[PDB]
Design an enzyme around this catalytic site. Sequence first.
Site, PDB file in Angstrom:
ATOM      1  N   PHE A 166      -8.005  -6.792   3.241  1.00  0.00           N
ATOM      2  CA  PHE A 166      -7.654  -5.434   3.552  1.00  0.00           C
ATOM      3  C   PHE A 166      -7.879  -4.595   2.366  1.00  0.00           C
ATOM      4  O   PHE A 166      -8.434  -3.527   2.448  1.00  0.00           O
ATOM      5  CB  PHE A 166      -6.162  -5.393   3.873  1.00  0.00           C
ATOM      6  CG  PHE A 166      -5.726  -4.038   4.342  1.00  0.00           C
ATOM      7  CD1 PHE A 166      -5.545  -3.709   5.689  1.00  0.00           C
ATOM      8  CD2 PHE A 166      -5.321  -3.090   3.419  1.00  0.00           C
ATOM      9  CE1 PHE A 166      -5.054  -2.471   6.125  1.00  0.00           C
ATOM     10  CE2 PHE A 166      -4.844  -1.845   3.842  1.00  0.00           C
ATOM     11  CZ  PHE A 166      -4.704  -1.498   5.184  1.00  0.00           C
TER      12      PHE A 166
ATOM     13  N   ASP B  31      -6.710   6.699  -4.382  1.00  0.00           N
ATOM     14  CA  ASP B  31      -6.186   5.374  -4.560  1.00  0.00           C
ATOM     15  C   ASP B  31      -6.250   4.981  -6.021  1.00  0.00           C
ATOM     16  O   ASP B  31      -6.608   5.775  -6.884  1.00  0.00           O
ATOM     17  CB  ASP B  31      -6.820   4.366  -3.586  1.00  0.00           C
ATOM     18  CG  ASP B  31      -8.263   4.016  -3.953  1.00  0.00           C
ATOM     19  OD1 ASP B  31      -8.870   4.595  -4.822  1.00  0.00           O
ATOM     20  OD2 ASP B  31      -8.845   3.098  -3.207  1.00  0.00           O
TER      21      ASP B  31
ATOM     22  N   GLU C 176       0.778  -1.246   0.000  1.00  0.00           N
ATOM     23  CA  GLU C 176       0.000   0.000   0.000  1.00  0.00           C
ATOM     24  C   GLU C 176       0.795   1.274   0.000  1.00  0.00           C
ATOM     25  O   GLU C 176       0.287   2.345  -0.314  1.00  0.00           O
ATOM     26  CB  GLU C 176      -0.844   0.001   1.283  1.00  0.00           C
ATOM     27  CG  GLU C 176      -1.819  -1.174   1.290  1.00  0.00           C
ATOM     28  CD  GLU C 176      -2.963  -0.953   0.338  1.00  0.00           C
ATOM     29  OE1 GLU C 176      -3.164   0.101  -0.235  1.00  0.00           O
ATOM     30  OE2 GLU C 176      -3.763  -1.974   0.244  1.00  0.00           O
TER      31      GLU C 176
END
Length: 162
Positions: A104, A20, A11
Amino acid sequence: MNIFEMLRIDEGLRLKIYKDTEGYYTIGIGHLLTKSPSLNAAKSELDKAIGRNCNGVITKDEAEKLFNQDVDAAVRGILRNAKLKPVYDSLDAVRRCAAINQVFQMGETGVAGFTNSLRMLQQKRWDEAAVNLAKSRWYNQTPNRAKRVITTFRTGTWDAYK
Ligand SMILES: OCCc1ccc(F)cc1
Ligand SMILES: [Cl-]
Ligand SMILES: [Cl-]
């Protein structure tokens, strides 16, 4: 290698609000803030999560605090899911990290529709599950990351993370 370092590799770490790969406001270590396109909505969410007026920026410690809660919430989400739980518990420790990563990244939701993959993983058909996992929007949109997770599931080692 552990879940944290792994996720930190996938990430990255940013201290200012960012977009994102799907264009949504996020911060820190992949912590999604909102799906709405209002930056102000995002800043609001940020202050709410951090407990202070951030003005779109946070500290490293703050990012890491979010990260901890987020890792934790994911596992817990897994454990509370009836379709997920049983698969998760049947796997070894490395592969369980691969499961947490996907969760996640995509939510308990997104993962819960990987039914065939789930079953294959549960039966320990590694190579088969790897091919199946590849046939997805997830692999198509973020292939480099997806590749690493897939390898992890396929092999049960951290080689893709070197
Ligand atoms: O393909 C998803 C693989 C997976 C297995 C177990 C779990 F808990 C979450 C995700
Ligand atoms: Cl919070
Ligand atoms: Cl990627």
